[PDB]
From a paper:
Here we describe [name] 1-18, a VH1-46-derived CD4bs antibody that exceeds the potency and breadth of most classical VH1-46- and VH1-2-derived bNAbs. To characterize [name] recognition by the 1-18 family of bNAbs, we solved cryo-EM structures of 1-18 and 1-55 Fabs in complex with soluble native-like [name] trimers and the V3-targeting [name] 10-1074 at resolutions of 2.5 Å (1-18 complexed with BG505SOSIP.664) and 3.9 Å (1-55 complexed with RC1, a designed immunogen that is a derivative of BG505SOSIP.664; Escolano et al., 2019). Notably, at 2.5-Å resolution, the 1-18 complex is the highest resolution view yet obtained of an [name]-1 [name] trimer. Both complexes contained three 1-18 family Fabs and three 10-1074 Fabs interacting with three-fold symmetry with a [name]-[name] trimer. 1-18 and 1-55 recognized the CD4bs similarly to other VH1-46-derived bNAbs, including 8ANC131 and CH235.12 (Bonsignori et al., 2016, Zhou et al., 2015), with interactions encompassing contacts with the N276gp120 and N197gp120 glycans, the CD4bs loop via the CDRH2, the V5 loop via the CDRH2, and loop D via the CDRL3.
However, in addition, 1-18 contacts [name] by residue F54HC, which is buried in the gp120 ‘Phe43 pocket’, and by residue R64HC, which makes a salt bridge with V5 residue D457gp120. V5 loop residue D457gp120 interacts with 1-18 R64HC, a somatic mutation from the VH1-46 germline that is present in 1-18 but not in 8ANC131. We hypothesize that the R64HC-D457gp120 salt bridge is a crucial interaction between 1-18 and gp120 that potentially allows it to tolerate common routes of [name] escape within the V5 loop. In addition to the canonical VH1-46 contacts, 1-18 contains a six-residue insertion in its CDRH1, resulting in a negatively charged 25DDDPYTDDD33 motif that interacts with the adjacent gp120 protomer. At the adjacent protomer, four Asp residues in the 1-18 CDRH1 (D25HC, D27HC, D31HC, and D32HC) plus T30HC form coordinated interactions around the highly conserved [name] residue K207gp120. In addition, the increased length of the 1-18 CDRH1 places Y29HC in a position to interact with residues in the V3 loop on the adjacent protomer (S306gp120, R308gp120, A316gp120, and Y318gp120). Although not all of the Asp residues in the 1-18 CDRH1 contact positively charged residues on gp120, the Asp-rich insertion may have been selected to carry an overall negative charge that is electrostatically attracted to the positively charged patch within the V3 loop on the adjacent protomer, which could drive formation of an initial [name]-antibody complex (Schreiber et al., 1996). Compared with the epitopes of the CD4bs bNAbs 3BNC117 and VRC01 (Lee et al., 2017, Stewart-Jones et al., 2016), 1-18 and 1-55 bury more surface area on both the primary gp120 epitope and the adjacent protomer, another potential mechanism for their increased breadth and potency (Chuang et al., 2019).
Author numbering:
A (entry chain O): 1 to 27, 27A, 28 to 107
B (entry chain F), F (entry chain C): 519 to 546, 569 to 663
C (entry chain P), E (entry chain G): 34 to 57, 65 to 78, 82 to 135, 152 to 185, 188 to 309, 312 to 321, 321A, 322 to 397, ...
D (entry chain N): 2 to 35, 35A, 35B, 35C, 35D, 35E, 35F, 36 to 52, ...
G (entry chain J): 300 to 309, 312 to 321, 321A, 322 to 353
Write the structure that this text describes.
C-alpha cells in the first residue's frame, strides 16, 4: 500500500514569498500518477497540478511541481491571499486511491 | 502544329517531335466532388510517371537514352521500319507484355550508375 | 540498339473515369454548379473501336441525372398531411373535385380546402371517398415550383490525362471500327430530355435515317432510330388552370388546382400526317436492309407495361403527358391534315422507379403549348415463328439509357499513356 | 464545468444514505458527462484526510469499490445516463463527513491518457447521529 | 568528409494517420464500400517498441465502428408514433402482449394493433398501462431489417508513406520490445464482434494462454485473456417467432412480434463443463505467474453496472442476448455435461450510450441458434487489503476498445522517413 | 531481394543498395473520405521531399554527393563503423538534433553553386 | 429581471426551454454610456468630419 507523507502539516509564510510543499511516498511513483489539490473550507476543491508537473486549466503560473521516485514538490513562487489553503497530494496506480495528509498554509 | 494527340496517326519518328504537346496536357453537390477527386486522380497519375522517370535517370527529359541494351526477345524489327512505318499505338500493342521487365532493367541500371558515380567521385 | 525512354507519346487505352459537367432561375440539373465551357482536333490515320452499347459515359449520365433529380427534391415540401381521406365529385370522370381537411400553421386548427385532382392520381377507398395514388407505399414530395424541368444542354468533360474520342463517320452504326476520329475535351451540348417511345429535341442524322441495334437479329434488343429530318409535334394542355396556395404548416405551402376558366378540353399532341408517313417510309426503307426486301413491315402499338412505356411520355411546361400513339404506329408496308394523339396528365410521378418515393408536380397556371422535334424512335421487334415474312415493330423504351445513348454513341473516353520505350542507337554516356 | 450534488443529510445509525451527482441541473439535458468520464466518490470526515470510496466507469457504469467499503457501498448511474448515485448502507457515526463527487478521465482518453480529478462538485454533508 | 544525401533509406518513426478499410446483402459495417484486398515482409534484426494500450489504431477502429453504426441507421424508420400508451397483459411476466393505437398511412385514421414486447423493453405508467423503455429520453430508430449485423472481417491498410509493423513474437505481452517484426500492407481480417465479458470468434494464442494487462499491479486495469484453444458456446432463442408488419405511415413499416408458435421457452447458452474447467485451470496457471504460487485464485461474478456488463452481452441472429454467467465464474483454486446459462433478450438497444438515441431491433422470424468460440476473457481484479492471499477475478468489459485491442495488439503504424544524410568521401564536382 | 523495408536491419552500406525499393512505395461515406484525403496527404509528403531534393541540387537522384563538409560536431565516428556497423534507424537516432542545420547548409551551398555557374557561363 | 428557465418535455428526447417566473422586480433592460465621454468622442468625430464637409 502506498502511503503519502506531507512533511510540515502547518506552514507559515508572508504574501509574496516562495513556498515549497513536499510529498514523500512509501515507494517509487510513476510520476504521471501524482496530483495536488487545494482544499479550503466552504469552497469547491480544485486540481492544482497533475502528472507531477502539469498545471490545470484555471491555474496560474506561480504554481509548479517537480519530483521523481518518492519525492514530489509543489512550489508557489509568489504567495497570494487566496493561496492560503490546505494542499493534498494523491497517488494513482492502484485502488484505493490514497491522499497525502495535507499541508495547511497560514499567513504570518 | 497538329494539336493534342494530333500525331497519333503519324509515324513514331514523326510523333517523337510532338512530345511537349501531349506532355503539357497531362496536368490540367453532385457536380462538386466529381470536379474534386478527378483532380487528385490527375495529380497522382502525373506523379507516378515522374517518379518512374526519376528512378531511371530521366527526370526533366522528354527523350532519354539509357544504358540498357535492346533484347531481341522483345521485338526484332529493325530501326527503319519502326520509326518510319509503325505508329506509337501499334508499337505499344506490340511490346505491351515486355514493359515491366524493361522497367525493372532501367531501374537496375540507374541505381548501378548512381553508386558507380558515387564511388568514382571519391577519388 | 539500346532502350530509350520517351515521355509524351500519343498512346491511349480504353478507360472509365468520372466526367465532370460544363454548361455555356435554378434548374433540376444544377448547371449553375457546372464549370463554364471553352478545341476539336482531327486525328488522321486513326481507326478506333467504338461500342455505343457498352459505353460507360451512358451509365455515368444515367447515375448523374438520377442524382440531380433527387438532389433538387430534398429541400422541398413533404406532402405527408396530404395523405388523408378525400371527398370527391366529378368536375363535369377524368377530373375530380376533391375536398379534404388539412393542417394549418397552428397545430390545433384544421382547414377545409379543395383541389382538382386528375383521376390517375386518386384511388377510391371502399360523394365517394378517395386518397392519393401512392399514399400507402410512398413518401410524396412536392416539386419545388420555382425549379425548372426544362432540359439545359450539358457538356461532359474528361479530366487531365483522359481524352474524349469522337467518331465523325456519318454512317456509323455505333459498333466496330470508326475511321474518322477526332479528339475533344468535352462533348456537344446534350439535353437530358426524358421521354419514352419517341426521341425529342435531339440530334439528327447527317445523310440518311440511321438504324442502330446492338444485334439486329436479337429481338430482345431495342432498335434506336435516328431521323435525318425532324418531325415536329405540337402538344397542348388547353385547360386554363388556376393555381391555389394552401398553408399546410409553418413555412409549408401546398399548390392546388383551383378552377378551370373556360372549357374543359383534353390535352393532346399533333403530328403532320404526311410528314409522319414520309418519315415512316424512310424508316421502312432503312429497315429492309436488315430483314429482306420482300419482308412485310408492320407497325403496331405498344405491347404492354406501365403507362410511361405504353404511351409516349414526356414533360412540357412542367406537366407530365402520357399520349396515346396508336395513331402513329398502325400501318403495314409491302414492297394539311394532322394525326391527333390524346394525352393524359399525371401529377404524382415516380420517374426513376424508387420504392417508397414519389413526386408531386405542382400545377402550372394557364395554358400549356409546346412545339418539339421528334428526332428518333425506340422500337422493339416481335419474335416471329421463323417461317414468317412479316416483321412487326412496336414503340419501346422505358430505359432512359437508350435516350442518352442516342446522343453519346459517337463518344468515347480514353486514358492517355504518355510513357513509351523504344530501341535506338543512343547510349547514355 | 461543475458538478451538482444533492442536499445535506441527517441519518440514524444503521440507515442508508443516497447522494446524487449531476453535471447539469437541467433534468432533460444531453450533457454526456458520465458516458465520457469516470466519477470518483471521496469523503472527508472532520480532522481527517480525504478518503476515496469508489469510482464509477463511463463505459457501462461499472463500479470499482474500495475494499473497506465494498460490502455496503453501491455506485449507480441513472438510466437516462445523466446522473450518478452513491448509496452507503449500514451507517455509523464515523461515516459522517462531507462527500464529494469528482470527474476524471482516469487514464482512458486517447491522446494523452492523463489522470486528474479536474472537476469537483460541492460536497454533501452527511451527519449520522441518534 | 562531405555530407551525402540519400533518398529512400529504411527509416520510420511512430505516427498516427487515417487508415482505410479493405475487405476480401448490405451490412452495418459497409464493407461493400471498402477496397478489395490483395504481402508480408519479414524484417530481420529489427527490434520494435510496441504498446497495445496506447494504440491509435484501436481508437480509430472504435470511432469507425460507431460511425458505421449510426450511418447504417439514418435512413430507417423513426418509431416516434410508437411512443403511446400500451395496454399489456401477460402472454402466459417475461413477455407482455401489448395493444395500442397506431397511425396509418391516412392521417385521419387510427389502427388498433398489438405486439409482443419483452418486459425489459417496457415500463409501466402509474390490463395495465405501459410504454416503451426509452420513450421519454430517446428518439428510437428501428433497425433496418434487411441490414445484417453479422460481423464481416475488415482489414486496416495504411496509406502511402506509412507502414504497419506486425509483432510476430508468439509470447508477446503487448508492451515493450518485440524482436520478431514484419511489415504488412494491411492487418488480418478483424471481425468487429461486439461482446462483453467473453471474447467471441477471435484469434487464439499460439502456444499458451496469454494474460495481458497494462499494469498487472494496478487493479483498475482490465486483464485481457487470450485462450490458446477455443471453448465453443451454443446459444439459442428457442421460441418460434412470427414477425408482423404494421403500416404506420406512408412507406413506413414497424415490425412487431406476432404469435409464438409452440412452447414459450427461455433463451440460453451452453458451455461444455469439462472444457470450461480445463480452460479455467490454464488461466489460473498463467495467472499464478503474476500473483504467487500460494495465492488462492477466486472467480466471482460481475461487480455491478448496466445489464450489458453484468451479463455476457452479444448479438447473433439479429437478437441481442444478455446471459447470466454466474455458472462460469464461481470457483476457488488453491495450490458430456453442460453449463447452461440463462439469457434475456432486449429489443431496444443503446449500444454506444448516446444520450437521446436508441435502436429498435426488429424481430427475427423463426428459431435462432448460434455456435461461437469463446477465444478470450476480460477480467477485473478486486482491490485487496494487502494482507490477503486471495485474488478475486470478476468478468469485466463494457469498453469495446478492449474488444478490438485483443486483435490489434500486435500491430503498429509508422511513418516512413526516406531522406537521410551521412558523411562520405564524395564531393560534388 | 528483401522487399519493402527489408534492409531496415541491414547495415547502412547494405541498405544503400535498396533505395529504389523504399522510394517507389512512397506514392501509391465513412470509408470514402478516409480513402480520399489520405491520398492528398501522401502527395504532399512526397512533394515536400522532392522540393527538398531540388533545393539542394539532388533532384532525380537517390544518392547525391554534395559540397557541404561534414562537421565533426555532428558525429565523430569513422566510415567503417558507420557504413558496416550501424543501421539507418540507429544513425537517424544519433543525428536527429543536427538535421535542420545540415539542411540549411545544403540550401545555401546549392544557391551559391547556382550563382557561380551563372556567373561562369557569362564569360 | 432574475429569469427562471423551465424545461418542458415536448417529444421523445426534445426539451423546450420556457421562461418560468421572474423573481423580484420587473424592470426594463437598458444600456448606460458615460455622458461626458460620449460627448467628447462626438466632438472628435465632428472634428474629423469637418475635414470632408
Ligand atoms: C506498474 O506499476 C508500478 C507501480 O507504479 C511501476 O513501478 C514504478 O515505475 C516507475 C516508472 O517511472 C518507477 O520510477 C522510476 O524509478 C527508477 C528507479 O528508481 C531508482 O533509481 C533512481 C536513480 O535514477 C533513484 O534516484 C531512485 O531513488 C528514488 O526513489 C526511491 C523509491 O524507489 C526513493 O526511496 C528514493 O529516496 C528516491 O526518491 C530509485 O532508487 C528511476 O530511475 C526513474 O527516474 C527516471 O524518470 C524520472 C521521471 O520519469 C526522471 O525524473 C529521472 O531523472 C529518471 O530519468 C523513475 O523514477 C518506480 O520506481 C516504480 N515503482 C515501483 C514500486 O515499482 C511499474 O513500472 C509499472 N509497470 C508498467 C509495465 O507500467
Ligand atoms: C369544386 O368544389 C367546390 C366545393 O367545395 C366548388 O366551390 C363552390 O362553388 C360554388 C359555385 O361556384 C360557390 O357558390 C357560390 O358562392 C357565391 C358567393 O356566395 C355569397 O354568399 C355567401 C352566403 O350564401 C357568402 O358567404 C359569400 O361571401 C358571398 O357573399 C354566390 O354568389 C354564388 O351564387 C351564384 O348564383 C347566383 C344566382 O342564384 C348568381 O347571381 C351569382 O352571381 C353566382 O353566380 C354561388 O352560390 C361556393 O362558394 C364554392 N365553395 C367553396 C368552398 O369554394 C368549386 O366551384 C368546384 N370546382 C369545380 C371546378 O367544379
Ligand atoms: C423541345 O424544345 C422546345 C424548344 O426549345 C421546347 O419548347 C419550349 O418549352 C418551354 C417550356 O415548355 C416554353 O417556355 C415557356 O413559355 C411560356 C410561354 O412563352 C411564351 O410567352 C413568353 C412571354 O410570356 C415569351 O417570352 C415566349 O417567347 C413565348 O412566346 C412561358 O409562360 C413559360 O414561363 C416559364 O419560364 C419562366 C422563365 O423565367 C418562368 O419565370 C415561369 O414561371 C414559367 O416557369 C416558359 O417560358 C417555350 O415556349 C417552348 N418553345 C416553343 C417554341 O414552343 C420543348 O419543351 C422541348 N420539348 C421537350 C420534351 O423538352
Ligand atoms: C395477444 O393478444 C391478442 C389480443 O389483442 C390475442 O389475439 C386474439 O386471440 C384470440 C384467441 O387466439 C382470438 O380469438 C379467436 O378468433 C377466431 C376467429 O374469430 C372468428 O369469428 C369472428 C367473430 O366472432 C370473426 O370476426 C372472424 O373473422 C372469425 O370468423 C375464433 O375462431 C377463435 O375461436 C376459437 O375457439 C373455438 C372454440 O370455442 C375453436 O373451435 C376455434 O377453432 C378457435 O380455436 C377465437 O375466438 C382473437 O381473434 C385475437 N384477437 C386479435 C385482435 O387478433 C393474441 O392471441 C395474443 N397473443 C399471445 C401470444 O398471447
Ligand atoms: C461466431 O461465428 C459463428 C460462425 O461464423 C456465427 O454463427 C453464425 O451466425 C449466423 C448469423 O449471422 C448464422 O447464419 C444464419 O443461419 C440461419 C440458418 O442457417 C441454416 O440454414 C440455412 C438455410 O436455411 C443454411 O444455408 C445454413 O448453412 C444453416 O444451415 C439463416 O436462416 C440466417 O439467414 C439470415 O441471413 C440470410 C443471408 O441471405 C438472409 O437472407 C436472412 O434473411 C437471414 O437474415 C443466417 O444465414 C449461422 O448459421 C451461424 N453459424 C453457426 C455455425 O452457428 C456466430 O454468430 C458468431 N458469433 C458472434 C457473436 O458474432
Ligand atoms: C497519315 O498517313 C499518310 C499516309 O502515309 C501520311 O502521308 C505521308 O506523309 C509523309 C509526311 O511525313 C510523307 O513523307 C509521305 O509521302 C505521305 N504519304 C502519302 C501516301 O501521302 C500522312 O502524313 C499521315 N498524317 C498524319 C497526320 O500523320
Ligand atoms: C362520376 O364519374 C364516374 C366516371 O364516369 C361515374 O362512374 C360511372 O357511372 C356510370 C353510370 O351508370 C356507371 O355505369 C359506371 O360503372 C361508373 N364507373 C365506374 C368506374 O364505376 C360516376 O357515376 C359519376 N358520378 C356522378 C354523380 O355522376
Ligand atoms: C373534416 O372534418 C370534419 C369535422 O370537423 C368532418 O365532418 C364530420 O363528418 C362526419 C362523418 O365522417 C360526421 O359524422 C360529422 O357530423 C361531421 N362533423 C363534425 C363536426 O364532426 C368531415 O367529414 C371531414 N372531411 C371533410 C372532407 O370535410
Ligand atoms: C405546330 O405549330 C407550328 C407553330 O409553332 C405550326 O407552324 C406554322 O404553320 C403555319 C401554317 O402551316 C405557317 O403559316 C407558319 O409559318 C408556321 N410556323 C409558325 C412559327 O407559326 C405547325 O403547323 C404546327 N404543326 C401541327 C402538326 O399542328
Ligand atoms: C388503325 O388502322 C385501322 C385500319 O387502317 C383503322 O381502322 C379503320 O378506321 C376507319 C376510320 O374509322 C374505318 O373507316 C375503317 O373501316 C377501319 N378499318 C379498316 C380495315 O380500314 C383504325 O382506325 C386505325 N387506328 C388508329 C388509332 O389510327
Ligand atoms: C402478470 O405477470 C406479472 C409478473 O409475474 C404479475 O405481477 C406479479 O403478480 C404477483 C401475484 O401475486 C404479485 O405478488 C407480484 O407483486 C407482481 N409483480 C410485480 C412486479 O408487481 C401479474 O400479476 C400478472 N398478471 C396477471 C393478471 O396474472
Ligand atoms: C454445440 O453444438 C455443436 C454442434 O454445432 C455440438 O457439436 C456436436 O456434438 C455431437 C455430439 O457430441 C457430435 O456428434 C458432432 O459431431 C458435433 N458437431 C456437429 C457439427 O454437430 C456440441 O455438442 C454443442 N455443445 C454443447 C455444449 O451443447
Ligand atoms: C456457485 O457455487 C456454489 C458453491 O459451489 C454453489 O452452491 C452449491 O450448489 C449445490 C447445487 O445446488 C448445492 O448442493 C450446494 O449445497 C451449494 N453450496 C455449496 C457450499 O456447495 C452454487 O450453486 C453455484 N452457483 C452457480 C450459479 O453455479
Ligand atoms: C542481420 O544481422 C546479421 C548479423 O550481423 C547479418 O549476418 C551478417 O550478414 C553479412 C552479409 O552482409 C555477413 O557478411 C556477415 O558475416 C553476417 N554475420 C553473421 C554473424 O551471420 C544478417 O545479414 C542481417 N540480416 C539482414 C537482413 O540485414
Ligand atoms: C460600467 O461598469 C464598470 C464596471 O465594470 C464601471 O467602472 C467602475 O467604476 C467605478 C466608479 O467609477 C470605479 O471605482 C471602478 O474602478 C470601475 N471599474 C470596475 C472594474 O469596477 C463603470 O462606471 C460603468 N459605466 C457606466 C457608464 O455605468
Ligand atoms: C527491316 O526488315 C524488313 C522486313 O524484313 C525489311 O524489308 C527491311 O529491308 C529491313 N531493313 C534493314 C535495314 O535491314
Ligand atoms: C503478350 O503476352 C501475353 C501473356 O499472357 C499473351 O497473352 C499475349 O498474347 C502476348 N501478346 C503478343 C502480341 O504476343
Ligand atoms: C539532441 O538534442 C536534444 C535537444 O533538445 C536533446 O534533448 C537530446 O538529448 C539530444 N540527443 C542526443 C542523442 O544527444
Amino acid at each position: 500500500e502506498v502511503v503519502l507523507t506531507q512533511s510540515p502539516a502547518i506552514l507559515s509564510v508572508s504574501p509574496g514569498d516562495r513556498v515549497i510543499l513536499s510529498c514523500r511516498a512509501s515507494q517509487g511513483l510513476d510520476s504521471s500518477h501524482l496530483a495536488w489539490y487545494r482544499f479550503k473550507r466552504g469552497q469547491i476543491p480544485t486540481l492544482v497540478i497533475f502528472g507531477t508537473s502539469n498545471r490545470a486549466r484555471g491555474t496560474p503560473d506561480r504554481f509548479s511541481g517537480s519530483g521523481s521516485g518518492a519525492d514530489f514538490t509543489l512550489t508557489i513562487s509568489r504567495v497570494e491571499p487566496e493561496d492560503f489553503a490546505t494542499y493534498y497530494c494523491q497517488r494513482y496506480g492502484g485502488t484505493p486511491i490514497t491522499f497525502g495528509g495535507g499541508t495547511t498554509l497560514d499567513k504570518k | 502544329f497538329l494539336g493534342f494527340l494530333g500525331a497519333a496517326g503519324s509515324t513514331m519518328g514523326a510523333a517523337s517531335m510532338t512530345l511537349t504537346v501531349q506532355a503539357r496536357n497531362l496536368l490540367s453537390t453532385v457536380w462538386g466532388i466529381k470536379q474534386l477527386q478527378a483532380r487528385v486522380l490527375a495529380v497522382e497519375r502525373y506523379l507516378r510517371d515522374q517518379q518512374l522517370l526519376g528512378i531511371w535517370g530521366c527526370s526533366g527529359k522528354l527523350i532519354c537514352c539509357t544504358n540498357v541494351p535492346w533484347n531481341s526477345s522483345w521485338s526484332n524489327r529493325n530501326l527503319s521500319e519502326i520509326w518510319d512505318n509503325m505508329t506509337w499505338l501499334q508499337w505499344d500493342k506490340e511490346i505491351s507484355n515486355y514493359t515491366q521487365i524493361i522497367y525493372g532493367l532501367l531501374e537496375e541500371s540507374q541505381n548501378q550508375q548512381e553508386k558507380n558515380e558515387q564511388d568514382l567521385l571519391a577519388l | 540498339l539500346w532502350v530509350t525512354v520517351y515521355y509524351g507519346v500519343p498512346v491511349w487505352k480504353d478507360a472509365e473515369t468520372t466526367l465532370f459537367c460544363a454548361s455555356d432561375k435554378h434548374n433540376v440539373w444544377a448547371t449553375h454548379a457546372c464549370v463554364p465551357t471553352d478545341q476539336e482536333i482531327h486525328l488522321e490515320n486513326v481507326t478506333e473501336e467504338f461500342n455505343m452499347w457498352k459505353n460507360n459515359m451512358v451509365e455515368q449520365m444515367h447515375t448523374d441525372i438520377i442524382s440531380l433529380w433527387d438532389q433538387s427534391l430534398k429541400p422541398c415540401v413533404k406532402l405527408t398531411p396530404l395523405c388523408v381521406t378525400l371527398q370527391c365529385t366529378n368536375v363535369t370522370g377524368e377530373l375530380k373535385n376533391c375536398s379534404f381537411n388539412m393542417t394549418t400553421e397552428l397545430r390545433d386548427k384544421k382547414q377545409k380546402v379543395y383541389s382538382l385532382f386528375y383521376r390517375l392520381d386518386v384511388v377510391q377507398i371502399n360523394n365517394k371517398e378517395y386518397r392519393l395514388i401512392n399514399c400507402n407505399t410512398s413518401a410524396i414530395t412536392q416539386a419545388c415550383p420555382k425549379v425548372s424541368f426544362e432540359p439545359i444542354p450539358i457538356h461532359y468533360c474528361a479530366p487531365a490525362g483522359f481524352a474524349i474520342l469522337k467518331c465523325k463517320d456519318k454512317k456509323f452504326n455505333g459498333t466496330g471500327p470508326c475511321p474518322s476520329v477526332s479528339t475533344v475535351q468535352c462533348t456537344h451540348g446534350i439535353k437530358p430530355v426524358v421521354s419514352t417511345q419517341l426521341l425529342l429535341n435531339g440530334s439528327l442524322a447527317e445523310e440518311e435515317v440511321m438504324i442502330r441495334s446492338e444485334n439486329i437479329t436479337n429481338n430482345a434488343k431495342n432498335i434506336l432510330v435516328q431521323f435525318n429530318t425532324p418531325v415536329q409535334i405540337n402538344c397542348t394542355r388547353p385547360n386554363n388552370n388556376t393555381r391555389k396556395s394552401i398553408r399546410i404548416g409553418p413555412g409549408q405551402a401546398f399548390y392546388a388546382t383551383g378552377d378551370i376558366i373556360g372549357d374543359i378540353r383534353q390535352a393532346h399532341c399533333n403530328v403532320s400526317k404526311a410528314t409522319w408517313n414520309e418519315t415512316l417510309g424512310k424508316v421502312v426503307k432503312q429497315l429492309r436492309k436488315h430483314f429482306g426486301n420482300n419482308t412485310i413491315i408492320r407497325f403496331a402499338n405498344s405491347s404492354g407495361g406501365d403507362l410511361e412505356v405504353t404511351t409516349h411520355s414526356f414533360n412540357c411546361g412542367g406537366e407530365f403527358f402520357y399520349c396515346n400513339t396508336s395513331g402513329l404506329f398502325n400501318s403495314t408496308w409491302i414492297s394539311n391534315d394532322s394525326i391527333t394523339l390524346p394525352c393524359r396528365i399525371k401529377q404524382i410521378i415516380n420517374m426513376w422507379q424508387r420504392i417508397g418515393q414519389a413526386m408531386y408536380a405542382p400545377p402550372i397556371q394557364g395554358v400549356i403549348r409546346c412545339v418539339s422535334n421528334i428526332t428518333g424512335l425506340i422500337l422493339t421487334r416481335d419474335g416471329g415463328s421463323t417461317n414468317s415474312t412479316t416483321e412487326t415493330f412496336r414503340p419501346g423504351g422505358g430505359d432512359m439509357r437508350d435516350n442518352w445513348r442516342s446522343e453519346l454513341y459517337k463518344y468515347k473516353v480514353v486514358k492517355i499513356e504518355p510513357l513509351g520505350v523504344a530501341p535506338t542507337r543512343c547510349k547514355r554516356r | 464545468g461543475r458538478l451538482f450534488q444533492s442536499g445535506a443529510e441527517v441519518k440514524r445509525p444503521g440507515a442508508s444514505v443516497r447522494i446524487s451527482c449531476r453535471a447539469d441541473d437541467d433534468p432533460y439535458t444531453d450533457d454526456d458527462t458520465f458516458t465520457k468520464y469516470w466519477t470518483h466518490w471521496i469523503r472527508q470526515a472532520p480532522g481527517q484526510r480525504p478518503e476515496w470510496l469508489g469510482v464509477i466507469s463511463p463505459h457501462f457504469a461499472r463500479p470499482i469499490y474500495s475494499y473497506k467499503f465494498r460490502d455496503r457501498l453501491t455506485l449507480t448511474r441513472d438510466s437516462s445516463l445523466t446522473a450518478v448515485y452513491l448509496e452507503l448502507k449500514g451507517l455509523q457515526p464515523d461515516d459522517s463527513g462531507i462527500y464529494f463527487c469528482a470527474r476524471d478521465p482516469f487514464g482512458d482518453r486517447a491522446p494523452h491518457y492523463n489522470y486528474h480529478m479536474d472537476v469537483w462538485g460541492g460536497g454533501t454533508a452527511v451527519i449520522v447521529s441518534s
